[PDB]
Design an enzyme around this catalytic site. Structure first.
Site, short mmCIF file in Angstrom:
data_model
loop_
_atom_site.label_atom_id
_atom_site.label_comp_id
_atom_site.label_asym_id
_atom_site.label_seq_id
_atom_site.Cartn_x
_atom_site.Cartn_y
_atom_site.Cartn_z
N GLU A 28 0.64 -2.58 0.98
CA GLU A 28 0.53 -1.98 -0.34
C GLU A 28 0.64 -0.46 -0.27
OE1 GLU A 28 0.37 -3.43 -3.24
OE2 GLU A 28 -0.23 -5.51 -2.88
N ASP A 29 1.68 0.01 0.40
CA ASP A 29 2.05 1.42 0.51
C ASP A 29 1.12 2.23 1.40
OD1 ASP A 29 4.51 2.10 -1.03
OD2 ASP A 29 3.37 1.24 -2.69
N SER A 30 0.21 1.59 2.13
CA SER A 30 -0.57 2.33 3.11
C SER A 30 0.28 2.61 4.34
CB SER A 30 -1.83 1.56 3.48
OG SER A 30 -2.72 1.46 2.39
N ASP A 51 -2.21 -0.24 -6.10
CA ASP A 51 -1.74 -0.16 -4.73
C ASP A 51 -2.26 1.13 -4.13
OD1 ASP A 51 -0.19 1.51 -6.23
OD2 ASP A 51 1.73 0.79 -5.47
#
Ligand SMILES: [Mg+2]
Ligand SMILES: [Zn+2]
Ligand SMILES: [Zn+2]
Ligand SMILES: [Zn+2]
Lengths: 113, 57, 49, 45, 67, 48, 56, 263, 147, 61
Positions: I1-3, B32
């Site tokens: 995704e955590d961006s 991620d």
RNA sequence: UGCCUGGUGUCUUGGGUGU
């Protein structure tokens, strides 16, 4: 380090044409227009103006990537009308609309000044 | 952990300083974008390029 | 006077709590470089066990 | 040949690569170089 | 360190209102009333003046390095 | 032997008009000048 | 810059320099010597430029 | 066919209602006013002396954000489009600042009023830092104590907010349409009742609320747009609106010329 | 995704902008009775095995001055160590290498402005310098943030 | 100049030194150290003089 | 005619980052 120069968003290189037109042969009387150093400001205006013309059967645009300042537009008119003429009519019509809008705003501002 | 942790991609040169992935491949890599780093290895021959494009793609 | 001075300075500088020639088997990491990244980090480091 | 500034009394002086590193008037052991005479330009961004 | 010139979110100029804000707070006005009197409507602008910490008053207490 | 190497220079044309720099590479007709304003080095023709 | 040098006493001896008479026509005087005077600290160039050296 | 109706007018903000225009045209106008109207801002700082506690590039960044009067910026030319060697008076404005604290006690504040215009285009009303009144000291730039001096020379150039946010004439453009949600362009999240859990729009009284027995109208389009234009003082609100319209017209005319010259 | 997506205009106005300082240290070592290192601007003639960087930013005393923009691999401290001379005294017109370069280059990946140069003496009475470099780091794609 | 000459000049200027904030702070610290030394020696006579001197020197703004 | 440089310790230890 790898950040591009900010003026590349709107400053056009000499070798890059502002406006490249290529036909789309999959369907009749359709062209693909590639605008360089432009974004949603011009694209959405043109698209929503052209969508109201009875002789334009398909108009769309997309910005491939936010990190590159260009967009590509697909236009497809009836049999009688050449698409480039429709694009020119759209540009002229929006120009007239903006002109009358400016005139009316000036009148109202002078009245309420 | 498994053989899907090494896969061969096609290069696209882009500005700024991060590797960029389609988000569907974040599952096999178990990756991620909260700070992970990934390694890139360049083949140096025609034979090796063919192996990468025909086996690990 | 060099004995005590060098012993104390070495143990505080390197963190090995013992004589210099007995660095092995000595308790290491007793002395650490103060973390000055931000004020809270320094305060946390000064109260660590 | 090159200017210096004391770390306590902020007194300007100069050294000849042979004098002891010391302020002439207060005897401080820490001195700083002076700013360059070149042009300094910033992009204001 | 010192009051920012422009609000980060929108871009209103808030750098000229620090002294007026302190003067208003000196007279006993509440923080909300002081911010309202300066014509800071959007809360994006209000957080700029409300949460600013003035550190330059601490840096200035050190003796200048030149004279 | 490239007398303009390691000399302060100013740009008079293009997108970097009026920016102070220092010449780093002087191969020919394309000078590499590091800019004092941002932290980057750019090519530039000698005429500029 | 040089008055505190130990050799400055003999260096300044016999020198000719422009002097402000005060009583101003500038004139030249001959140095017969120097004498340190305690308690007569004076501003030499600025406020911080305290000096005890005196020129006879 | 398009109509404009002004609600409130000021030197710094105008609140107006557009009607009989497409939503795309109003949004393009908003975007153009936000990021494509040219103004004048400091772009180069030459620091001749800076003994203050702030870093040189800290002060440079602060200076770049100071708004300057940009009334006659149309006559001015872009820096990259001026054939002159170095900078002339027709493509740049030179301002100079010199601040110093005298005495061994107290603190001196450096304001934007201390920026003095040295050179610029002849008889063009550009370059002067914007002041609210004649007695407004302006934006606080720095602070000084004894024996600290700031001596800089700044050069102002013409640009747009696409390149850097310091050239943006507007602060925040409020934009709004269809207060009563007759077009059903949004679906209202709720817990019990969506009508009493959502605050009324500030223009809710300008449009008749839908009748209880009214059916949905699928033939309707957004027709009236309410927008407020706030400026930083470099340009008046009417100037911002008119110049945004003119910039949009110029862009479309350029596209038209490219099309006509392509053949 | 955590961006996350950040406003570019807020970054332009100074959001999350920061200041970076790095210091370099060097001192003159004593190897013997009269074998000492010297802070100086080494010349291509009297010294051998020089760094590939540039020495043109050094002052007369071998130290860079504050306010000078530096790039990677530039020499900020000029130091030389003596070397026993060879038989070059045969026919060299004083242009024979007697010293070896021990200069301190700036880190290859870093650049900035020389902020402050400190010159003093160590406990042993030898020269001792510290150079502090300053740069500004603006947020960009890939920088890590957290609540 | 030599190291000894520098020390002599510094002492001479210190004799000429009317006041300096750094030097005043150093003098006050030295006086405090002398005062604690006198306290540890149970000298009730010296400590009074040192306290009086510290009171005279102090009272900063 | 005055003519351009690639060459970078080691061993311990500590603190961190992503799983
Ligand atoms: Mg992770
Ligand atoms: Zn001093
Ligand atoms: Zn705001
Ligand atoms: Zn010009």
């Amino acid at each position: 380090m790898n950040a591009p120069d900010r003026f590349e968003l709107f400053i056009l290189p000499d070798d890059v044409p502002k406006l490249k037109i290529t036909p789309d042969s999959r369907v009749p009387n359709c062209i693909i227009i590639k605008f360089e150093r432009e974004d949603h400001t011009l694209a959405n205006l043109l698209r929503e103006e052209l969508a109201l013309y009875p002789d334009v059967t398909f108009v769309a645009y997309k910005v491939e990537h936010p990190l590159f300042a260009n967009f590509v537009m697909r236009l497809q008119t009836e049999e009688g009308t050449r698409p480039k003429q429709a694009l020119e009519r759209a540009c002229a019509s929006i120009i007239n609309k903006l002109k009358t809008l400016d005139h009316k705003f000036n009148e109202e501002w002078n009245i309420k000044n | 952990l498994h053989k899907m942790s090494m896969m061969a991609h096609r290069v696209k040169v882009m500005p700024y300083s991060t590797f960029r992935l389609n988000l569907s491949v974040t599952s096999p890599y178990n990756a991620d974008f909260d700070g992970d780093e990934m390694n890139l290895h360049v083949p140096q021959s025609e034979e090796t390029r063919a192996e990468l494009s025909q086996l690990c793609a | 006077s060099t004995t005590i001075t060098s012993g104390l300075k070495y143990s505080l500088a390197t963190g090995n709590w013992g004589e210099q020639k007995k660095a092995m088997s000595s308790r290491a990491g007793v002395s650490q470089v103060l973390n000055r990244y931000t004020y809270s980090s320094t305060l946390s480091h000064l109260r660590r066990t | 040949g090159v200017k210096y500034t004391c770390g306590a009394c902020a007194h300007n002086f100069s050294l000849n690569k042979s004098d002891p590193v010391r302020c002439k008037e207060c005897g401080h052991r820490v001195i700083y170089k002076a700013r360059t005479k070149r042009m300094i330009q910033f992009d204001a961004r | 360190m010192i009051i920012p010139v422009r609000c980060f979110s929108c871009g209103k100029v808030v750098g000229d209102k620090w002294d007026a804000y302190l003067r208003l707070l000196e007279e006993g006005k509440q923080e909300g009333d002081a911010l309202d009197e300066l014509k800071l409507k959007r809360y994006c602008c209000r957080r700029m003046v409300l949460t600013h910490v003035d550190l330059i008053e601490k840096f200035l207490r050190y003796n200048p390095l030149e004279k | 032997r490239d007398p303009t190497l390691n000399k302060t220079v100013k740009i008079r044309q293009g997108g970097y008009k009026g920016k102070i720099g220092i010449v780093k590479e002087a191969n020919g007709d394309r000078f590499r000048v590091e800019l004092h304003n941002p932290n980057k080095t750019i090519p530039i023709p000698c005429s500029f | 810059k040089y008055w505190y040098y130990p050799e400055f006493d003999d260096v300044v001896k016999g020198m000719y320099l422009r002097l402000n008479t005060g009583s101003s026509p500038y004139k030249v005087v001959e140095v017969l010597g120097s004498q340190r005077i305690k308690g007569s600290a004076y501003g030499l160039n600025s406020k911080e430029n305290n000096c005890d050296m005196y020129l006879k | 066919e398009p109509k404009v109706n002004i609600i409130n007018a000021q030197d710094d903000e105008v609140e107006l209602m557009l009607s009989d225009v497409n939503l795309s045209l109003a949004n393009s106008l908003r975007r153009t006013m936000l990021a494509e109207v040219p103004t004048l801002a400091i772009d180069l700082v030459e620091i001749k002396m800076n003994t203050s506690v702030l870093a040189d590039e800290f002060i440079s960044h602060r200076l770049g954000l100071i708004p300057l009067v940009s009334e006659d910026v149309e006559e001015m030319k872009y820096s990259r489009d001026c054939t002159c060697e170095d900078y002339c008076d027709e493509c740049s404005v030179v301002l100079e600042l010199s601040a110093r604290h005298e005495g061994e006690e107290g603190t001196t504040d450096v304001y934007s009023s201390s920026l003095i215009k040295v050179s610029g285009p002849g008889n063009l009303n550009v370059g002067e830092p914007v002041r609210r009144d004649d007695y407004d000291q302006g934006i606080l730039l720095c602070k000084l104590r004894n024996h600290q001096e700031l001596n800089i020379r700044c050069i102002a150039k013409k640009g747009i907010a696409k390149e850097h946010a310091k050239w943006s004439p507007c602060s925040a453009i409020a934009f709004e349409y269809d207060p009563h949600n007759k077009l059903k362009h949004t679906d209202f999240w709720f817990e019990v009742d969506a009508k009493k859990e959502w605050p009324d729009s500030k223009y809710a009284t300008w449009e008749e609320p839908p009748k209880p027995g009214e059916v949905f109208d699928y033939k309707a389009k957004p027709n009236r747009f309410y927008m407020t234009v706030e400026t930083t003082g470099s340009l008046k609100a009417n100037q911002v609106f008119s110049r945004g319209i003119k910039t949009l017209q110029e862009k479309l005319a350029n596209v038209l010329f490219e099309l006509e010259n392509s053949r | 995704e955590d961006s996350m997506i950040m406003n570019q205009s807020s970054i332009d106005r100074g959001l999350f902008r920061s200041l970076f300082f790095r210091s370099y240290m060097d001192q003159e070592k004593r190897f013997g009775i009269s074998i000492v290192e010297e802070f100086e601007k080494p010349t291509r003639a009297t010294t051998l095995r020089l760094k590939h960087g540039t020495y043109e930013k050094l002052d007369e005393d071998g130290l860079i001055a504050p306010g000078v923009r530096v790039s990677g691999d530039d020499i900020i401290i000029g130091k030389t160590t003596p070397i026993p001379p060879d038989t070059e005294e045969l026919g060299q017109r004083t242009k024979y290498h007697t010293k070896r370069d021990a200069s301190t280059p700036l880190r290859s990946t870093e650049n900035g402005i020389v902020d402050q140069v400190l010159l003093t003496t160590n406990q042993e009475g030898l020269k001792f310098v510290k150079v502090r470099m300053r740069t500004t780091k603006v947020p960009q794609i890939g920088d890590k943030f957290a609540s | 100049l030599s190291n000894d000459e520098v020390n002599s000049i510094v002492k001479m200027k210190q004799s000429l030194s009317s006041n300096t904030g750094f030097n005043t702070v150093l003098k006050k610290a030295q006086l405090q150290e002398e005062l604690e030394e006198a306290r540890d020696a149970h000298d009730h006579e010296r400590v009074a003089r040192i306290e009086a001197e510290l009171k005279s020197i102090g009272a900063e703004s």
